Amino acid sequence: SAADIEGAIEDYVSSFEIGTVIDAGDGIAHVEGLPSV
């Protein structure tokens, strides 16, 4: 079809920020999440 796949992925996305410290030490930290930072 090559087109209904589009609507499929859009419906998927429609149907589909706080980070988290994963490690820290010596004044440096690593944060998972925050995709928009």
Partner: protein
């Protein structure tokens, strides 16, 4: 044919390839979008879904 069409549209292939998202959703996506068709062998459909 499925491999060729999947190569043609890298967006859908990459979306499926994200194992972070639960696999049930992605296999349902494949079933409803690509694997669910009139002229699709059921054995090939099952193999691809697996």
């Amino acid at each position: 044919r499925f491999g060729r069409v999947l190569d043609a549209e890298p967006r859908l292939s990459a979306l499926l390839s994200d194992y972070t998202t639960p696999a049930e959703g992605r296999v349902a996506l494949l079933d409803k979008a690509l694997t669910g068709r009139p002229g699709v062998n059921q054995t090939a459909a099952a193999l691809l879904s697996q």
